[PDB]
C-alpha cells in the first residue's frame, strides 16, 4: 500500500486564506476530491495508476488536510456553501481547461457532482465511489452507524467531534477494512491535532447530509445534480463497494439508472481508498484511456 503521500504540496491563496493542493503532470485534468475527514492523502495510492494520462491534481478541502483554517470558527463555519465558495475559486485558479475528468469521493462527490452539473461543458467524465448521490432518509443511512451520525447532529456533536476527535479516530479507521499503520493515521489526524475548532469540519461536515429534508440548502443542491446525473450522457465510472456503506441499497439502486456509465466493484466499506486502491487506480486509468484516446 505505502503511507507516503503522493508529489508534493503545493500552495495557493483563495479568498484571503492559503489551500493546499497536489498537482503533477500536463495536460487535461484528472480531479480528485476527498471528502470528510480525509485530504489529498487519501488519494496517495491511486493516483499513481494515472500517471501520463493528465495532469493529476488533488485539492485539501479549506480547513482540512495542509489548507488553512476560516479563524473564528464556530457551529455556522465549514458548511457546504462556505467550501464550494472556496473549492470553486481554487479550480477556476487551477486553469482547469474544459476536458476535465472528476473523481471524488464522499463530500468530494457532493462538490464534484454539484460543479459538474454547474459547468457541464466542462466536463469529460465522471469516477465517483461511497458518494452522496441524491437526498437520503436515515433508513438509506447505514444501520451501524445511523445513532452516531443522529448523535453529531445534536447538541452532543460538539463533545464527540470537537473535543473527542471521533470522526478521525473512530469513524475512519471504523469503515476501513484493513489495519492502518502508525504513519497512515497520522497523517490523517495531522489536521486535527489540536482540540477545539480545529477539528469543527469534521463535525460540521455530518450536519450538512441531506438527510430527511435538513439542511434544506443541501438537500436541494443534490436534488439538483442527481435529476441531472440521472440523463446526462457525460461518461461515468462507478466503482462500488462491498460490502460498501454509503453508496447501498435505495442510493446504489438509483446511481445503477445513471446514463453511460461504467460499474466495477472493488473490496471496502466506505473509505475503500485504503482497501482497494490498485483496483480503484486501474479502473480509473482504463476509463481515462477510453477517454482520451490516442
Ligand atoms: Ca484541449
Ligand atoms: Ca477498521
Ligand atoms: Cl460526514
Redesign the pocket.
Given at each position: 500500500l505505502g503511507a507516503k503521500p503522493f508529489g508534493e504540496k503545493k500552495f495557493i491563496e483563495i479568498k484571503g486564506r492559503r489551500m493546499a493542493y497536489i498537482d503533477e503532470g500536463t495536460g487535461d485534468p484528472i480531479l480528485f476530491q476527498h471528502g470528510n475527514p480525509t485530504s489529498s492523502y487519501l488519494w496517495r495510492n491511486i493516483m499513481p495508476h494515472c500517471a501520463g494520462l493528465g495532469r493529476l491534481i488533488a485539492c485539501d478541502l479549506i480547513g482540512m488536510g495542509d489548507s488553512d483554517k476560516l479563524d473564528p470558527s464556530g457551529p455556522e463555519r465549514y458548511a457546504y456553501a462556505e467550501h464550494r465558495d472556496y473549492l470553486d475559486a481554487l479550480w477556476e485558479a487551477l486553469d482547469l481547461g474544459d476536458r476535465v475528468v472528476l473523481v471524488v469521493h464522499d463530500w468530494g462527490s457532493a462538490l464534484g457532482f454539484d460543479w459538474a452539473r454547474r459547468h457541464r461543458e466542462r466536463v469529460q467524465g465522471i469516477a465517483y465511489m461511497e458518494a452522496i448521490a441524491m437526498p437520503i432518509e436515515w433508513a438509506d443511512f447505514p444501520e451501524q452507524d445511523r445513532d452516531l451520525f443522529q448523535a453529531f447532529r445534536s447538541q452532543a456533536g460538539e463533545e464527540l467531534v470537537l473535543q473527542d476527535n471521533v470522526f478521525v479516530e473512530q469513524v475512519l479507521?471504523?469503515?476501513?477494512?484493513?489495519?492502518?499503520s502508525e504513519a497512515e493515521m497520522a497523517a490523517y489526524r495531522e489536521p486535527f491535532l489540536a482540540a477545539g475548532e480545529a477539528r469543527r469540519p469534521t463535525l460540521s461536515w455530518p450536519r450538512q447530509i441531506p438527510i430527511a429534508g435538513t439542511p434544506a440548502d443541501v438537500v436541494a443542491i443534490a436534488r439538483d445534480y442527481a435529476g441531472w446525473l440521472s440523463e446526462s450522457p457525460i461518461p461515468k465510472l462507478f466503482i462500488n463497494a462491498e460490502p460498501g456503506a454509503l453508496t447501498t441499497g435505495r442510493m446504489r439502486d438509483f446511481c445503477r439508472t445513471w446514463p453511460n456509465q461504467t460499474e466495477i466493484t472493488v473490496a471496502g466499506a466506505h473509505f475503500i481508498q485504503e482497501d482497494s486502491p490498485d483496483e480503484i487506480g486501474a479502473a480509473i486509468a482504463a476509463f481515462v484511456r477510453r477517454l482520451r484516446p490516442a
Amino acid at each position: 500500500l505505502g503511507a507516503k503521500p503522493f508529489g508534493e504540496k503545493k500552495f495557493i491563496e483563495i479568498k484571503g486564506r492559503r489551500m493546499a493542493y497536489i498537482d503533477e503532470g500536463t495536460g487535461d485534468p484528472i480531479l480528485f476530491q476527498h471528502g470528510n475527514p480525509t485530504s489529498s492523502y487519501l488519494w496517495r495510492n491511486i493516483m499513481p495508476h494515472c500517471a501520463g494520462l493528465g495532469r493529476l491534481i488533488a485539492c485539501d478541502l479549506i480547513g482540512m488536510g495542509d489548507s488553512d483554517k476560516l479563524d473564528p470558527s464556530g457551529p455556522e463555519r465549514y458548511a457546504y456553501a462556505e467550501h464550494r465558495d472556496y473549492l470553486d475559486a481554487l479550480w477556476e485558479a487551477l486553469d482547469l481547461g474544459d476536458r476535465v475528468v472528476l473523481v471524488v469521493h464522499d463530500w468530494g462527490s457532493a462538490l464534484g457532482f454539484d460543479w459538474a452539473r454547474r459547468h457541464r461543458e466542462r466536463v469529460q467524465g465522471i469516477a465517483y465511489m461511497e458518494a452522496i448521490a441524491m437526498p437520503i432518509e436515515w433508513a438509506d443511512f447505514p444501520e451501524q452507524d445511523r445513532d452516531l451520525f443522529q448523535a453529531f447532529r445534536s447538541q452532543a456533536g460538539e463533545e464527540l467531534v470537537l473535543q473527542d476527535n471521533v470522526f478521525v479516530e473512530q469513524v475512519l479507521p471504523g469503515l476501513i477494512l484493513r489495519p492502518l499503520s502508525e504513519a497512515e493515521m497520522a497523517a490523517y489526524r495531522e489536521p486535527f491535532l489540536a482540540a477545539g475548532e480545529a477539528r469543527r469540519p469534521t463535525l460540521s461536515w455530518p450536519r450538512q447530509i441531506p438527510i430527511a429534508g435538513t439542511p434544506a440548502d443541501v438537500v436541494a443542491i443534490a436534488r439538483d445534480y442527481a435529476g441531472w446525473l440521472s440523463e446526462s450522457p457525460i461518461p461515468k465510472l462507478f466503482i462500488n463497494a462491498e460490502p460498501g456503506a454509503l453508496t447501498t441499497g435505495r442510493m446504489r439502486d438509483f446511481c445503477r439508472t445513471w446514463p453511460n456509465q461504467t460499474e466495477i466493484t472493488v473490496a471496502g466499506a466506505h473509505f475503500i481508498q485504503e482497501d482497494s486502491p490498485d483496483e480503484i487506480g486501474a479502473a480509473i486509468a482504463a476509463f481515462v484511456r477510453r477517454l482520451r484516446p490516442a
